[PDB]
Write a protein that binds this ligand. Structure first.
Ligand code: 42S
Ligand code: MG
Lengths: 69, 50, 104, 1340, 452
């Protein structure tokens, strides 16, 4: 279901927004989870360009530069 | 109610008919004002999932 | 102890005066210079929780309304950066030694 | 007919005669508080009762007792006006006599000493105005009446949702006025449970044990007895013949040598009748039938002394054997039937973990206060303290009454605590409900809904104060020395005063009166709320309680309620409604005895009204008032249907009584959909007063009542002739019949002049009377704001045309002619109170001095030498009202600033400019200035000028008082002297002061001279004391806050007229916002050449169904017609005859109305004036549901010279060509609500910022930016705009760096952003890291 | 940080932290004094409780702040925030360079612009104004520029006209639902304090004129100007993202205009005559010779682009009315005359714009829509449409329907009195007859009102 599917999100900063904050922070903190951003909500939170639309050019150019030569 | 409103707005409505109309009105406002919130909650869940 | 001492007097004098002792009333009753009532009475107060809710029950809390007075307006900072260009311009208008002496 | 009615009369359509007339609308507010503060020689509610409750206070066993004698309320420190100006609270000191007695140690009780401390002072309790308002800080405030669940017992269902097996459940709830809740409830296994408050569930019987009931007596209480006899041998039984109903024979039922019932044959009414008439008391039963039967009492073996069976145990064939051989003849069993009498309590015992009283008390004490070790004295103390203590528990009178009544008892009044009988009875009733006999009540019913009011609540808060003072008194009486302390040293002031102050000051029900409007005031003062303390919440309660109930009829207005977060959680009080004796809501009705409708009034409560059949406000009867039709629409029990001719017990009093004063003010309400009517009566309260109070041209007839009953106007105390009329005051000379013998008199009314209201509007009274005019008692002397000649004018009616005009009227949009803004009719006067505070900083005191760093001569011009703006000086945004300067030393400048100062030789001041300046954009004229000073700080120049001025004005006023009064008295002495010793010319020669010597012949008139002497001298000295007091009140330094030395308040009166963006609406729920203000040139006009004021969009009419707004238009036009004709005949100056004729013709109108009319009126001087008042238009009254009809309107239009259609030809003011089709033009009453556009309008570029998180915040009333939310973010996300969003949440807001770096680029001409990281997230990092959580920013 | 009256205010964390310190220090003391176990244990538990209360309060005891009942806010409560789940980005954030106010109509506007109050635009664009004033050298320095605009010297208004021109502003309404809740417009400087908003856009905002307010935001960075103009612009969204149907559809007054325009009565001035073209049709109408609605043959030239990217032309005598003829002047190019020859209801008037879009492209559709609005308002105003009390016609047969249906209920009632029908079945019966009656009256008044 939609409310169930929204539960799983790779980015923990994103999850901390609309889910229960405490649990997300703990449960992420134990596994040492590393948030790579890559999404909208998280990038909005951290205050940089949205990885879509006008910003899609930037992130792409950054995404390919990443994990590369 | 098995005794409808036999009058209309062009004519006058008496005490009873108006009093009975009142419930329909209040339930209308309440229901719509609530469905706004339901809609919002739904859009929330939706953008969260997408 | 001083503060408490003031409270004691304020108690009897509350109904005794039927209203309450004037701000300078408890002052004569107490030994010291007696204008100290204001200072002591003020500093004795406990700070208010910055989380104290105000209005609507909404998340507006007292602390949300406390502005930064230590900041500097942009409408000013612009004029600082401008004034630099101003005095720097006008210091190019004198002899290099007058400029050196004035910049010094 | 009254005197201001001769001035103007409202033509009244409608048929139904008014049997009862609208009472005082402020009734509730005044009555309640009237009961709160008062001396009642018994426990009836008041300060007396609340005293008698917590008193007398005795110490703990020490035999030192403090009792209560009597109390009094001293005269207010300041009166209402002065209290309003100064800002203090209008209150009276509470002085209460206490008696401290000390009993000799080891009594027979007698006192060593008893000191009576004379009236120790506790608190100052606020006082209610004659208008039903309170003044807390310089501000009129209203306390809303409350609606809650009445104290008593209540039986509910909770069917459906629980457990989804159906089966329902049945629960009872005992709700005290004060103290813990006692709840009883079943469960799916039919086990009776009990819980105190909302706490842990416990098996019901566990409470009974705590009342000292052993199991045997619980069974003896809740079950009947089935008797078993072993007589001769083998099992007989006692049979009550009714017991066999609802059961099938388990064996051969036979006795008396005759077989009544066989095996397998169910026992019906036939078998039962046979048994009853053949009278079979005892029958023979098998030994196996008792296999299921539960034994009643305990059973032991007489010989062995051992328990054979415990009470409430299931017998078996073997157990019967073991108790039979022991010599037991009789066995008592429970009477149990799964249909009729349920075996509930029995099974309740089996789930009961306890045994004896102490056990139950342990399990209760450990329930209420768990985790801590239980004690015997502790459990006993607690349990006795819960429902059985006079201290901790009361249902009071309403509670006890509803309790006993719901239990079908006799006594309507009783103890305020619970008795074992009470709990037991309630349980019995619940079990009876589960058994099928009896029904469950419902919460929404107004018989279960009780109404409080200011007095009762204030009593409660004062009570709380008294308990917290009680603890103190006992605490002190613990260690006390005998004769030193007295009832002062114990009882404090602050606790009680702060209880009451915390109530009136801040409570959800205590609120600033909404005074922009008389209707607003009066409709606020009658208001109900289910919110606040002891009530539900919006989040808590669902649609059931919000919804309209059949019981709301005549009590609560169905159509006036707020539309929003709380709907139906407020409502309003109806027109004729009254608080019941017990506090319920009751309504007026007409008693129909036999076949006649009697005009005797009868008040019926929600439960009273229930069984009776009540007729309709609208019905046809005639002559003797017998019902014409053989059947008429009526409502009897919770429903409405056709009822037979003579059935009906009662009839509605008025056509109005269903609605409220607000709804009753909507003309042609019957023609409007309930939603729009709601919105209409909702907005009508928002109408800002106008400059010229107009009058409604279309009306109801309630407006008179609203105008008068609300304190906005000035009503004659006594009738007489006006001696003096000024825009300031009004002096009336009283008639002798209404006049008291002593003091003679005249009534002097001091009118309220221009002053600040709560909404910052202008409240100003104007005299409606002229020099030397007859006035009758209860007549309007002066109108207030938005009232005209005793009626209520909330706005101004105007010529309106329905037609689309070039889209400028597009949605609700309103298109208004320039004629309107020019005529200054919709103009409004605002009175704003601005303040300037002189505080104290460690750097130094702040000065109000007129010497201000960095201001021109034009700036310091408008200020006097002292620094305060002159009275009457017109000001705009930026102008300095009060010069103020605060020390800030050592500016700490920089190199180039130092060079700058070096060259230009300027001394940068040690003082910064704090001066109060008029807020940006607002402009008005200064109507007043006040200066408050700390007691002991020297008053400055201006403030002193003000003080001397006020002093002189005071002396002048008081002197005027004494002069008019004295003249008034001596004028009576002159008149009495002339009887019995008349000398006319002789008497007025000698000095008036020497008159009192001359006597009279023996008579009562000598004693009258005596009276006038006494009262004369009384006034003479009263003047003196009043002057002294006034002077002292002027000169005393008002007490201020800590740190503030002095305060200067300037009062600005702004005059705003009307502009596009303002909100406007009719009474019908039709909104609009003025779009363009069009020239008189472009206005659609008729053939006569007369333009139209406003052009409404017709498209708004059909969809939202309010057809009344159209009728209101039509009749309005018609009204104006009758005006215009008269306006011509007065301009013709025909004569009194023609005018009289036409006016009478108007006032009759064709047949059957209740109005009556003139020629009792003086044919010349009185009639011409009426005609003069009618020439603007002819005022009409359309009763709420009794209102006019199409035919009547069209007929009035015939008298008008105007068409039946209500539509005419109109020509575009632009092209001059005609308009195809006729358009509806008429006169609609239109209100200006205060949404006015130059309040709402806000703009910000770069303002101040919040400290905790750096974010835009208004500190100057320079507004914080608009809040960009999640949805707006999504909206930006749907578009491809990243940069708009980034700049939105980074540089424009949260980035302490990026914002300024942006500003410099915006001015440089470079549009870019160098964003950085938003401070919110940057703070969140620190907040997270503050815990044991390490959050880092990786890589690059 | 300090307050007025010399009062202080501080976060609750201090109250918490302080505690944790005190007890901690005390514990240290209790170690150096060699206290018994029972004591140092209690102190340890207390330290645990204090730290717990500091980090996340409410998971043990819920400690209360000094002198105040309300539980003190801990660090977890600082992080969580409130209003359900909102993290201060989520609930909202205050933003500079913005504003708001009551909104009004402004039908004169092109669809791409909006009326902006002068004062608002002044306070909003203030930094731009400052920079532009000294760019041309009308102000010595930034300070002097401030003094100039604060004095509202006459020269600044023109400079504002400069900074406004190509520089869009974002408009937003209160319940933002879909992306059309925010749209970019070109500002038009307007005297008065109200914002003017193009009528055709009123549908997308769901904005009535009854006092709804709108907010404005300034697109500061260049990228924001181009984002606003190329994305959030009004003219760039003519279609709902939910479905390809036009959201720019004419609303009410306008459609009553076009409806009243192309419609025909049976007999009216100029009926049957013939005219050379729409020009002289309008010329016939305005002069008062011919009625707005009359059956008439007129020669028209329509176009079809049905060639390859190429407009074909054809002329004929069309049987139409005067109104449709006049209206045809607006219809651009390749649209057939068939589209305006009908009655033009709200539904057809939409498909007009739609077909126009799917055929001629964006720009012609935009300008078309504008024209449709203008002419709609104009002609609707000309029409003199109104509403009277006699405009609502009740059926003559109403009372009779009521009476017969009233006979039915007393029939079924008489049947219940005699037990011929059960209570419930009775109820259903009576309710059915009343419903049927309602339908009858409805279909009476519908016929009478419609064709009479
Ligand atoms: O015939 N039914 C009703 N008649 C009726 C009419 C007037 C007053 C009270 C009841 C009725 C019964 C229950 C509830 C309602 C109400 F509140 F919704 F209007 C109306
Ligand atoms: Mg709206």
């Amino acid at each position: 279901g939609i409310t169930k599917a929204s539960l799983a999100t790779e980015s923990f900063i994103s999850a901390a927004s609309f889910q229960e904050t405490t649990r997300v922070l703990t449960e992420a903190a134990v596994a040492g989870k590393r948030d790579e951003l890559r999404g909208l909500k998280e990038n909005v939170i951290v205050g940089r360009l949205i990885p879509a639309g006008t910003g899609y050019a930037y992130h792409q150019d950054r995404m390919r530069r990443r994990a590369a030569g | 109610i098995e005794t409808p409103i036999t009058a209309n707005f062009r004519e006058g409505l008496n005490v009873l008919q108006y009093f009975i109309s009142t419930h329909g009105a209040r339930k209308g406002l309440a229901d719509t004002a609530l469905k706004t919130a339901n809609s919002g909650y739904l859009t929330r869940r939706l953008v969260d999932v997408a | 102890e001083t503060i408490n001492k003031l409270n004691r007097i304020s108690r009897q004098m509350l109904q005794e005066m039927g209203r309450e002792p004037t701000p300078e009333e408890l002052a004569e009753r107490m030994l010291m210079p007696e204008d100290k009532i204001r200072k002591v009475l003020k500093i004795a107060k406990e700070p208010i929780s910055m989380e104290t809710p105000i209005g609507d029950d909404e998340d507006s809390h007292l602390g949300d309304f406390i502005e930064d007075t230590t900041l500097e307006l942009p409408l000013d900072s612009a004029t600082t950066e401008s004034l630099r260009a101003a005095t720097h311009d006008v210091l190019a208008g004198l002899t290099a030694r007058e400029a050196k002496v004035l910049r010094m | 007919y009254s005197y201001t009615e001769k001035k103007r009369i409202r033509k009244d359509f409608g048929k139904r005669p008014q049997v009862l007339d609208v009472p005082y609308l402020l009734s509730i507010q005044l009555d309640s508080f009237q009961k709160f503060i008062e001396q009642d020689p018994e426990g009836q509610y008041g300060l007396e009762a609340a005293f008698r409750s917590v008193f007398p206070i005795q110490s703990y066993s020490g035999n030192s007792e403090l009792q209560y004698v009597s109390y009094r309320l001293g005269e207010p420190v300041f009166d209402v006006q002065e209290c309003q100006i100064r800002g203090v609270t209008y209150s009276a000191p509470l002085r209460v006599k206490l008696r401290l007695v000390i009993y000799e140690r080891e009594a027979p009780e007698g006192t060593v000493k008893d000191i009576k401390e004379q009236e120790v002072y506790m608190g100052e309790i606020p006082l209610m105005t004659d208008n039903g308002t309170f003044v807390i800080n310089g501000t009129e405030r209203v306390i809303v009446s409350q609606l809650h669940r009445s104290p008593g017992v209540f039986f509910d269902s909770d069917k459906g949702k629980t457990h989804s097996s159906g089966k329902v459940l049945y629960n009872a709830r005992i709700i005290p006025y004060r103290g813990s809740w006692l709840d009883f409830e079943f469960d799916p296994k039919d086990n009776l449970f009990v819980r105190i408050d909302r706490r842990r569930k416990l098996p019901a019987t566990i409470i009974l044990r705590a009342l000292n009931y052993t199991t045997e007596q619980i069974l003896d209480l809740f079950f009947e007895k089935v008797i078993f006899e072993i007589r001769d041998n083998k099992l007989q039984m006692e049979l009550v013949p009714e017991r066999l109903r609802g059961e099938t024979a388990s064996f051969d039922i036979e006795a008396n040598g005759k077989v009544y019932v066989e095996k397998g044959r169910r026992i019906t009414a036939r078998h039962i009748r046979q048994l009853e008439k053949d009278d079979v008391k005892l029958i023979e039963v098998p030994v196996e039938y008792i296999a299921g039967k539960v034994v009643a009492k305990d059973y032991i073996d007489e010989s062995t002394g051992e328990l054979i069976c415990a009470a409430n145990m299931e017998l078996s064939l073997d157990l019967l054997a073991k108790l039979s051989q022991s010599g037991h003849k009789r066995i008592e069993t429970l009477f149990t039937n799964d249909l009729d009498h349920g075996p509930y309590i029995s099974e309740t015992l089996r789930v009961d973990p306890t045994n004896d009283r102490l056990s139950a008390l342990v399990e209760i004490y450990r329930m209420m206060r768990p985790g801590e070790p239980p004690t015997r004295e502790a459990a006993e103390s607690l349990f006795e303290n819960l429902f059985f203590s006079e201290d901790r528990y009361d249902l009071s009178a309403v509670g006890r009454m509803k309790f006993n009544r719901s239990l079908l008892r006799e006594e309507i009044e009783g103890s305020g605590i619970l008795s074992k009988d009470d709990i037991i009875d309630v349980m019995k009733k619940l079990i009876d409900i589960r058994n099928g006999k009896g029904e469950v009540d419902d919460i929404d019913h107004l018989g279960n809904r009780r109404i409080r009011s200011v007095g009762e609540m204030a009593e409660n808060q004062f009570r709380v104060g008294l308990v917290r003072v009680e603890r103190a008194v006992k605490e002190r009486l613990s260690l006390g020395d005998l004769d030193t302390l007295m009832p002062q040293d114990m009882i404090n002031a602050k606790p009680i005063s702060a209880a009451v102050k915390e109530f009136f000051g801040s409570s959800q029900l205590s609120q600033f009166m909404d005074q922009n409007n008389p209707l607003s005031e009066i409709t606020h003062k009658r208001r109900i709320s289910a919110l606040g303390p002891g009530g539900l919440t919006r989040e808590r309660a669902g649609f059931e309680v919000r919804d309209v109930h059949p019981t709301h009829y005549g009590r609560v207005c169905p159509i006036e309620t707020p539309e929003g977060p709380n709907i139906g959680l407020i409502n309003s009080l109806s027109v004729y409604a009254q608080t019941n004796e017990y506090g319920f809501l009751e309504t007026p009705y007409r008693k129909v005895t036999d076949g006649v409708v009697t005009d005797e009034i009868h008040y019926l409560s929600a439960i009273e009204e229930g069984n009776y059949v009540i007729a309709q406000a609208n019905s046809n009867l005639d002559e003797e008032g017998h019902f014409v039709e053989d059947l008429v629409t009526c409502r009897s029990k919770g429903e409405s249907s056709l009822f037979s001719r003579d059935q009906v017990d009662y009839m509605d009093v008025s056509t109005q009584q269903v609605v409220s004063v607000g709804a009753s003010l909507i003309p042609f309400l019957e023609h409007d959909d309930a939603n729009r009517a709601l919105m209409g009566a909702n907005m009508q309260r928002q109408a800002v007063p106008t400059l010229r109070a107009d009058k409604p041209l279309v009306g109801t007839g309630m407006e008179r009542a609203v105008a008068v009953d609300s304190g906005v106007t000035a009503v004659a105390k006594r009738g007489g002739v006006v001696q003096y009329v000024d825009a300031s005051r009004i002096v009336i000379k009283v008639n002798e019949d209404e006049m008291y013998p002593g003091e003679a008199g005249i009534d002097i009314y001091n009118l309220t002049k221009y002053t600040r209201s709560n909404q910052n509007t202008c409240i100003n009274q104007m005299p409606c009377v002229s020099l030397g005019e007859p006035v009758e008692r209860g007549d309007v002397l002066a109108d207030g704001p938005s009232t005209d000649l005793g009626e209520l004018a909330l706005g101004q009616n105007m010529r309106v045309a329905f037609m689309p005009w070039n889209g400028y009227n597009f949605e609700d949009s309103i298109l208004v002619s320039e004629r309107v803004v020019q005529e200054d009719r919709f103009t409004t006067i605002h009175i704003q109170e601005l303040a300037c505070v002189s505080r104290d900083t460690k750097l130094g005191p702040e000065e109000i001095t007129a010497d201000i760093p960095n201001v021109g001569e034009a700036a310091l011009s408008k200020l006097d030498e002292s620094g305060i703006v002159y009275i009457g000086a017109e000001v705009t945004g930026g102008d300095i009202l009060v010069g103020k300067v605060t020390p800030k030393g050592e500016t700490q400048l920089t190199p180039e600033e130092k060079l700058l100062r070096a060259i230009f030789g300027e001394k940068a001041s040690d003082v910064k400019d704090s001066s109060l300046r008029v807020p940006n954009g607002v402009s008005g004229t200064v109507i007043d200035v006040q200066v408050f000073t700390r007691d002991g700080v020297e008053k400055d120049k201006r403030a002193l000028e003000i003080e001397e001025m006020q002093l002189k004005q005071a002396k002048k006023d008081l002197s005027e008082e004494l002069q008019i009064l004295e003249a008034g008295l001596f004028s009576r002495i002159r008149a009495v002297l002339v009887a019995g010793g008349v000398e006319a010319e002789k008497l007025d020669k000698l000095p008036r002061d020497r008159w009192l010597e001359l006597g009279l012949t023996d008579e009562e008139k000598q004693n009258q001279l005596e009276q006038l002497a006494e009262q004369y001298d009384e006034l003479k000295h009263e003047f003196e004391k009043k002057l002294e007091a006034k002077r002292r009140k002027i000169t005393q330094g008002d007490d201020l806050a800590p740190g503030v030395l002095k305060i200067v308040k300037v009062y600005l009166a702004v005059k705003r007229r009307i502009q596009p963006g303002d909100k406007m609406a009719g009474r019908h729920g039709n909104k609009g916002v003025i779009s363009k203000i069009n020239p008189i040139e472009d206005m659609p006009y008729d053939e006569n050449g007369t333009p139209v004021d406003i052009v409404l969009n017709p498209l708004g009419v059909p969809s939202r169904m309010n057809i009344g707004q159209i009728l209101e238009t039509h009749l309005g036009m018609a009204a104006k017609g009758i005006g215009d004709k008269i306006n011509a005949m007065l301009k013709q100056q025909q004569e009194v005859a023609k005018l009289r004729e036409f006016i009478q013709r108007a006032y009759d109108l064709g047949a059957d109305v209740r109005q009556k009319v003139d020629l009792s009126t003086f044919s010349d001087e009185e009639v011409m004036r009426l005609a003069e008042n009618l020439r603007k238009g002819m005022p009409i009254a359309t009763p709420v549901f009794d209102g006019a009809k199409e035919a009547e309107i069209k007929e009035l239009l015939k008298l008008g010279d105007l068409p039946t259609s209500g539509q005419i030809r109109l020509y575009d003011g632009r092209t001059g060509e005609q308009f195809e089709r006729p358009v509806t033009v008429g006169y609609m009453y239109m209100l200006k609500l205060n949404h006015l556009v130059d309040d709402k309008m806000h703009a910000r570029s770069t303002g101040s910022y919040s400290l905790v998180t750096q974010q835009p915040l208004g500190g100057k009333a320079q507004f914080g930016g608009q809040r960009f939310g999640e949805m707006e973010v999504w909206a930006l996300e749907a578009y491809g705009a990243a940069y708009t969003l980034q700049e939105m949440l980074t540089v424009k807001s949260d980035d302490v760096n990026g914002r300024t770096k942006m500003y410099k680029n915006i001015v440089d001409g470079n549009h870019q952003m160098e964003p950085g990281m938003p401070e919110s997230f940057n703070v969140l990092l620190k907040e997270i890291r503050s815990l044991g959580i390490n959050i880092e920013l990786e890589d690059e | 940080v300090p307050l007025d009256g010399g009062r202080f205010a501080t976060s609750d964390l201090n109250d918490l932290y302080r505690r944790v310190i005190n007890r901690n220090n005390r514990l240290k003391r209790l170690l150096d004094l060699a206290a018994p176990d029972i004591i140092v244990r209690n102190e340890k538990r207390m330290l645990q409780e204090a730290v717990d209360a500091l980090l996340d309060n409410g998971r043990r005891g819920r400690a209360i702040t000094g002198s105040n009942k309300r539980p003190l806010k801990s660090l977890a409560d600082m992080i969580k925030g409130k209003q359900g789940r909102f993290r201060q980005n989520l609930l909202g954030k205050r933003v500079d360079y913005s504003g708001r106010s009551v909104i009004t109509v402004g039908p004169y506007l092109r669809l791409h612009q909006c009326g902006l109050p002068k004062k608002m635009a002044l306070e909003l664009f203030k930094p731009f104004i400052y920079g532009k004033l000294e760019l041309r050298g009308l102000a010595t320095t930034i300070k002097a520029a401030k003094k100039m605009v604060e004095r509202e010297e006459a020269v600044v208004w023109d400079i504002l006209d400069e900074v406004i021109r190509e520089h869009p502003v974002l408009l937003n309404r209160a319940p933002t639902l879909h992306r059309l809740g925010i749209q970019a417009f070109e500002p038009v400087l307007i005297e008065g304090k109200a914002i003017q908003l193009h009528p055709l856009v009123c549908a997308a905002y769901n904005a009535d004129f009854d006092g709804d307010q709108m907010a404005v935001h300034v697109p500061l960075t260049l990228e924001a100007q181009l984002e606003a103009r190329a994305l959030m612009m009004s003219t760039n969204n003519i279609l709902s993202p939910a479905n390809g149907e036009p959201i720019i559809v004419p609303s009410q007054d306008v459609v009553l205009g076009l409806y009243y325009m192309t419609r025909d009565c049976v007999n009216a001035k100029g009926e049957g005559m013939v005219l050379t073209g729409p020009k002289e049709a309008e010329r016939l109408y305005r002069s008062g010779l011919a009625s707005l609605h009359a059956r008439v043959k007129v020669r028209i030239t329509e176009y079809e682009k049905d060639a390859n990217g190429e407009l074909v032309a054809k002329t004929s005598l069309k049987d139409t009315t005067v109104g449709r003829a006049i209206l045809w002047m607006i219809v651009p190019k390749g649209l057939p005359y068939s589209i305006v020859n009908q009655a033009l209801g709200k539904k057809a008037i939409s498909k007009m714009l739609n077909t126009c879009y799917r055929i001629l492209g964006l720009k012609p559709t935009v300008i078309f829509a504008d024209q449709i609005m203008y002419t709609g308002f104009a002609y609707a105003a000309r029409s003199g449409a109104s509403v009277g009390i006699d405009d609502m016609v009740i059926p003559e047969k109403k009372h009779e329907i009521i009476s017969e249906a009233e006979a039915e209920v007393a029939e079924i009632q008489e049947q219940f009195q005699s037990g011929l029908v059960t209570a419930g079945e009775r109820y259903n019966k009576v309710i059915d007859i009343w419903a049927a009656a309602n339908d009858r009256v409805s279909k009476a008044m519908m016929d009478n009102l419609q064709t009479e």
